[PDB]
Design a protein around this ligand. Sequence first.
Ligand SMILES: Nc1nc2c(ncn2[C@@H]2O[C@H](COP(=O)(O)OP(=O)(O)O)[C@@H](O)[C@H]2O)c(=O)[nH]1
Ligand SMILES: Nc1nc2c(ncn2[C@@H]2O[C@H](COP(=O)(O)OP(=O)(O)O)[C@@H](O)[C@H]2O)c(=O)[nH]1
Lengths: 308, 315
Amino acid sequence: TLPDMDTLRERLLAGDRAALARAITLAESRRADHRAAVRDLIDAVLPQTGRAIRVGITGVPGVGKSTTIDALGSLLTAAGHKVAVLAVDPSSRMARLAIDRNAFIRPSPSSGTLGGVAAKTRETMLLCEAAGFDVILVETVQSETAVADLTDFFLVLMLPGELQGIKKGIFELADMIAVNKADDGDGERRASAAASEYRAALHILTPPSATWTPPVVTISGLHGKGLDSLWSRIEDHRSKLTATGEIAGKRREQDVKWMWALVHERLHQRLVGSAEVRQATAEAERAVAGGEHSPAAGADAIATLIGL
Amino acid sequence: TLPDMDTLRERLLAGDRAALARAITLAESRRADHRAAVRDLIDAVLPQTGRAIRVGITGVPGVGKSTTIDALGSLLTAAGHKVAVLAVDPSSKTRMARLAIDRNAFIRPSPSSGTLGGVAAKTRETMLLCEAAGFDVILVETVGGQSETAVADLTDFFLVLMLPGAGDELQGIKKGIFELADMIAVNKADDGDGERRASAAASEYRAALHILTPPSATWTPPVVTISGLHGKGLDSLWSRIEDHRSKLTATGEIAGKRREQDVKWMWALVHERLHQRLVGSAEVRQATAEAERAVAGGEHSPAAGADAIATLIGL
Ligand SMILES: Nc1nc2c(ncn2[C@@H]2O[C@H](COP(=O)(O)OP(=O)(O)O)[C@@H](O)[C@H]2O)c(=O)[nH]1
Ligand SMILES: Nc1nc2c(ncn2[C@@H]2O[C@H](COP(=O)(O)OP(=O)(O)O)[C@@H](O)[C@H]2O)c(=O)[nH]1
């Protein structure tokens, strides 16, 4: 009734890409035993995970994120890395990387809650690491904090110059800002001028006791400029924060966060699993949003629905 | 032992602080029917809530937050406001000693709960009680955890207090918190050297905010200097908070933020109820700890831990 998960596990650990893809396919099937088998497989290969650089990447639409990931991912595969690109979308391109046999690109997983989407992304990351991927890029497509809380290093891409340049509260979380579109000629001057502004703000906000002082750099994703320097900074961070234990410390905190997120996703699934409860939950939420009932009145109405 | 909740409600709505205190005191009771009765009373006076300015206040230990709230709260009661000061401690007066004897102020420590979500959500409930009792200024302060974001998500206006310099080489404020500020106030701007060092620091924070704030924002956060201890700059500080209220009331943004916050604290309480079931017997509390430890220690995957926990209570 179930597939041969022992043999799938062995093939995956031996680097068989078909096995990695199949494990991810089984995790998104409608059968609960398929999903449980892949859960059990991930748990079984946990000791072979973690040996990767996990980089989160965000930026406003049009900044050049797809292009930059495509270019950076190709630079890394050329250099002997195996690169996974995982998207995170609460609503749940890269064409050259898409044909690269050492890259593995996946869209955002489906879940009831953004916590669930993000936590499923952690589980996919672990699968990828067990399968031998040593670079995990997680991109936003809210999702920004989730992606920072999924990765070791948070890279924010910015335009080289009346809206938010990036969502309020996200700039200060950057481990590096890369100002994109530093194209030959004036593009370089402009982006470098913009980098000087972001660099002033970020260094005002960075205490000298911080282990890592976030750099601000200029790049051209389109023309492949500045990407080696960018990556070298991520590797420097890995070395420095591995030395302090701060990468382990952050991962432990993230993993507990995603565990609780999945417990909350299980709760959410119980609340939308039947029409009555789904409607009653909606009504309570509407009453609170509308100022008709207090937040605790809505909460207790919902908690009683499922005997909590 | 069951109080007359209909008469308690009537007195509270009339401004009686004793009824207000009794209601908050019944809310922290270890009896579920007391707490339920207070939950019900809040839900019943909801139409009399909301007519206040809600200000969250944070800053590093020793910045002068107690002193500034004591001074600001006194300024406001002097001007005819009734001011409530509510603390949020993630791990749950004499400071604020002058405001503590003020008949038009009401100070309460942080409520206790199993989760920070719970503490914050109970603080929202207390805020509603205070508003119903006629408090028109609600100051919510961080103490002790992730209390800063919680306090920002409890209030209309987020005030961050800063020291007049960063020579201790530490975070001047939690990473992540700065850009959330609706105003930065650099405290200890005492006549003479203090105010010079405060003005210098202010210029730096103002530059960073100038860079980060887009021109489309309804509100551009100011950076000001104050002395909570000597009562300098507090009128100007409050006038800025009133300007923000007027401006974001016109755009519907205060209502919008409040709606989002209320739904957040609703879910936080649902999650607290879940937490209560998981720590409610020694056996399940320990099994939940073991799961959490296994995940923290990289012994089992987050989903393995989660499903172990969910199965403990038949989820
Ligand atoms: N001139 C220039 N254009 C770029 C660069 N990177 C991306 N773009 C362009 O910006 C547009 C948006 O890029 P895309 O990668 O889709 O942005 P995303 O929405 O951030 O994923 C496309 O026309 C890209 O070719 C760059 O370094 N220089
Ligand atoms: N010189 C000066 N000292 C202040 C000022 N505000 C607070 N303080 C002092 O700083 C210390 C900490 O103040 P407190 O209000 O307890 O700080 P909290 O820990 O942020 O609540 C106390 O000794 C205060 O008297 C101020 O405006 N000027």
